[PDB]
Write an enzyme that holds these catalytic residues in place. Sequence first.
Site, short mmCIF file in Angstrom:
data_model
loop_
_atom_site.label_atom_id
_atom_site.label_comp_id
_atom_site.label_asym_id
_atom_site.label_seq_id
_atom_site.Cartn_x
_atom_site.Cartn_y
_atom_site.Cartn_z
N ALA A 1 -2.31 -13.50 7.99
CA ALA A 1 -2.30 -12.78 6.73
C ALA A 1 -3.67 -12.83 6.07
O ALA A 1 -4.34 -13.86 6.08
CB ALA A 1 -1.26 -13.36 5.78
N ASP A 2 -4.09 -11.70 5.49
CA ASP A 2 -5.30 -11.67 4.67
C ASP A 2 -4.93 -11.48 3.20
O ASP A 2 -3.75 -11.49 2.83
CB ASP A 2 -6.28 -10.60 5.16
CG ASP A 2 -5.70 -9.19 5.15
OD1 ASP A 2 -4.71 -8.91 4.44
OD2 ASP A 2 -6.29 -8.34 5.86
#
Lengths: 77, 77, 404, 404
Positions: free
Chosen positions: A34-35
Site C-alpha cells: 500500500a502507498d
Amino acid sequence: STIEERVKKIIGEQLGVKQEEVTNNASFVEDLGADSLDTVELVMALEEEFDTEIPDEEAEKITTVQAAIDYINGHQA
Amino acid sequence: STIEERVKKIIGEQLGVKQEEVTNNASFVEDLGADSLDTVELVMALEEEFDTEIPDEEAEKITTVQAAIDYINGHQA
Amino acid sequence: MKRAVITGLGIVSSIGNNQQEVLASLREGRSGITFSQELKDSGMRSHVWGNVKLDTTGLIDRKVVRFMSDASIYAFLSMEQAIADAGLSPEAYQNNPRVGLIAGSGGGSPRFQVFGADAMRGPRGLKAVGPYVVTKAMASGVSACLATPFKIHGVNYSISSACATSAHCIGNAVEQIQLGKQDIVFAGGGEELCWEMACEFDAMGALSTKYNDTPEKASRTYDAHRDGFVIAGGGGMVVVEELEHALARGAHIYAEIVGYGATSDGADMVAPSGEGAVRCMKMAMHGVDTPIDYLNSHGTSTPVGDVKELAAIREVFGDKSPAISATKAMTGHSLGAAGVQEAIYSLLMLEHGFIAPSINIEELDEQAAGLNIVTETTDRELTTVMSNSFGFGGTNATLVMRKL
Amino acid sequence: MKRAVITGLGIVSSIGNNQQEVLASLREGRSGITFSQELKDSGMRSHVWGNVKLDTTGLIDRKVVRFMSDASIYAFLSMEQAIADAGLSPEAYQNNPRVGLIAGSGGGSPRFQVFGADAMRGPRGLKAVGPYVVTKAMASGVSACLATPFKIHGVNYSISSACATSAHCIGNAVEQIQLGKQDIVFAGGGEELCWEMACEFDAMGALSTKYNDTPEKASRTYDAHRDGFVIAGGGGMVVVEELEHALARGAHIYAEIVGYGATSDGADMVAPSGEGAVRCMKMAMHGVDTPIDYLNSHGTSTPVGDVKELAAIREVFGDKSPAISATKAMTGHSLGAAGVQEAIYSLLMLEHGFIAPSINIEELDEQAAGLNIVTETTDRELTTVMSNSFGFGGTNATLVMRKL
C-alpha cells in the site's frame, strides 16, 4: 460472510492481492504494497462496506489486516 | 418596455451593437455580425428573458429581429 | 536529421479491438456506429455513437487502473498491443532514457471531473471524492497513466489540439527521433465516450440528429444530406523508431514517416478556413518525391467542414487525383484518438494493399465533383499515403507515410 | 542548429498583473496568498489560495472572450503583454507561417465542464448548456483561444504534463526554432482557480490545511512544518525567437535558452523519484559551459516533494550547489501556469541582478543541509539560471537560461 472475510475481500481488491496474501497480521504498507493514496481509499472502502464512519485519529492506527478486523468487530452497535 | 422593446434589448446586448442598429428588418447574420454560435446563444437569451421555450423547428426561423418579435408576440409573453 | 519509421501499432476502436478486427471492418466497409441509450437518456438529440465493444474488466492490474479514466484504459490496451506488435520486451524499452511516450486526449475526463464535483457536493464531501480523481481528469492523464507503469524514462508528456491531438503526438514523436533525442517514442492517444462530453457538442449543433433510427447511416461524409458528426471513443498507439535502430534489431517496418505538417488558420474558432489546411498538406509533402496515392481525409460529416476540406484538397492537388476516403463514415469521430486511429487505418491500407471505402454517400455533394472519392473497397498497391486532422481553434496536422 | 532567445515576457500571477508588479513583489518577498471563502464554502480543508488580483470582467472583446475559460483569459492577457514587450507590430507576427503558439493548461476547465453537466441535468437540459462549453473545457483551450484571435499561422497546439505543462511548452517552442521550422513561437500557459479543481487535490491530502488563519504563512517550501501546497491560478507567456531574427530587428533579448531537459521517472504516479529529476537537470546542463548561478526549484511545499527535490539537487551539484530559492512560498502553485511563470521570475532575476528569497523558512528541513538556500533578497550579478518543474505521472522538465 463474516467480518473477517469481508475485511480481507476489501483489502485484497483495494491493493490488488489475492485473498491469500491477505493474512491477519499483514501490514498494508510493509507487506501488501500500500502507498499513501491506497491508505486513503482503503479507509473509504472499509467505511462503505461496513456502513461506519472511521475518525481520522482511529484510521491512523489501522495499519494491519487484524487492526481493521478488530476495529469493525468493536464498532458494530 | 413592450415585447418589441424587450426583444431589441436582448438582441443588441447579445450581439454587442448599439441599440439603434436593431431595426425590425435587421438580420442577425447579414446586418448584426452574428455567426452560427451567436444565434444559438441569442435564442437562449430570448428564452430566459421571456420565460418560454422555443422549439428547434421554430428557432431556425428566427434569423431576423422581426421574426423574434413575431414569435414572442404570437406566443403570449 | 534521422529517419523515423513505424514498427508496431495497437488500436481499440468502434470497428475493432485490435488491428486484425479493424482490418476486416475496413475491408468490408463495416460501421461501428450503434444506438446509445445513455445519450438518449441524458436528454441529447443525437442518440448514436461509435462505441468500443469490449469488456475491459480485469484487463489492467489494480495498482495501474486505479489512476485511469477510459481514455487512459483505451490507450494503455493499445500500447500493450503496440509493444507486442513491435517485438519489444521490457529489457529493451523499460528504464531506458532513449525511450519516450507522447500521447494525449482532447478533453481529459469530463466524466471524472463531474464525478469529483458531484461527490464533493454530496453528503460525504471530500471523503466521497477519493484520491484518484486528479490523474483521471487532468489533461495529461493518458501520458501519465502509461509512462509510469511501462517504466518510461525518456520524454513523457501529452499534446492536445482538439481533434488533431494524436496526429500532433505522432509528429512530435517523429521530431524527437529526428533530433536524435530518442530511439523509440510511443505515440498516440485515447478518448472516453460519455454523455458528459457529448452533450456539449450537441449544444453547439455539431452532432448528427436526423438518423437516430438508422445508426449506421448517420455518419455520411460528403453526402448531400449529412447533418453533423457521430461521436466515438477509443485509443491507438504507434511505435515511432529511428530507422537504423529498427533495422539493427530486424524490426518489422510498416512505413517511414516522410512528412509532418502542423499549421494554424488564425481565422475561425470552430470552422476550418481551408487556407491553413492547404499549407499543412503542402508542408507535409515537401521533399517527398513520390505522389500521394491515398488520402484519409479528416471528413467529419459536418455541412461546413466537409466542403472546406474538399476545396483545400482540390487546391493542393489540382490535376492529380489521389484516392480519397473518409473512414469516419464507418467509425465516427473519436476526437483526441482520431489522429492516431486514422494513421493506423492508413498504415493498414498501405500494408495490405487496399483502399477502404467512403461509405453512406447516397448523393455526392456538388462540391466534391471531380475528386477520386472511393466508395467501394478497392485493392491497390499503395506506396505513399496521407492523413489529415483538423481541430477547433484552427489547428491542422498532416502525416505522410511511405513504404521503405 | 539555430539558437533560441527570449525577447518578450507577459504574466498575470498572484504576485502581480505585469512584470513590473511581479518584480516588486519578488524583491520584497511579498506573498500572493489570501483566504478563500469559496474554498471554505465548498467543504474543503484548505481555505487559502494564490488568486489573481484583477477583475477580468469585460476586459477582452466579447466576440473573443465568449470562447474562453479563465486559463485562456490569463494566457491571453499575458500574450498581449509579451507581444508589446517584444516590440512586435501586428504586421510582424500575424498571418505569418513562421510564427507559432504552444501554450497549455494542466486541466482545461473543471469549472465549465461541471457547468455543462449541471446545466444538462437541470430543468432546461440541452437549452441551458449553450454553444461555448467545448472551447472552454477542452484541453487545448489555451492554445485554441489565443491562436485564433492573434491570427497565428504557424504551429498551434498545447502541451500538457500536469505541473510541468508550460515548461514543456517553452522547451518545445525552442525545439521548433532549433529545427528551423519557426522564427517566433509564443510559449506559455494558464490555469483557472476554482473549488471544482482544488477539491480533488484536498481529497489526495496534497494541500496545506493547518495555516488557514495565517494565509501568507501556509506556503513554506523547505520548512520543517510545511503541510502541502497552496493552489494558485494565473498565466504567463514568453516570446521564443530565433537568434539571428531577433538581432536583425533590434529586439531586446533577455536570455538565450541554452538547455532543455525532459525526462520521465517511470516509477510513482504522484511522488517524484528524484532519479528522473537528476537526469533532467543533467540533460539541461549538457553543453552548457558556465556554472548555474541560481536555481528556481520546483519547491511545492509538500513533505514528500521537497525532500526528493533537495536530494536530486544534492546529487547533481554536490558541494557546489547554486543559490536556490522556491518562489512558490510567495506565489502558491499555479499548476499548468507554473513553468512559464517561474521561467519569467528567473528571467527577471537574471535581468535585474537579484535572487528572490525563499520565504517562510522558520526551521530548515534536515534534508537541505549544505545547500545554499537563499532566504533574503540578495543583489548578485547572475549569468546562468535554471528552473525545474515536475508533474504527476513522473514527468520532469528543466530550463537553463543564460545571458548573451
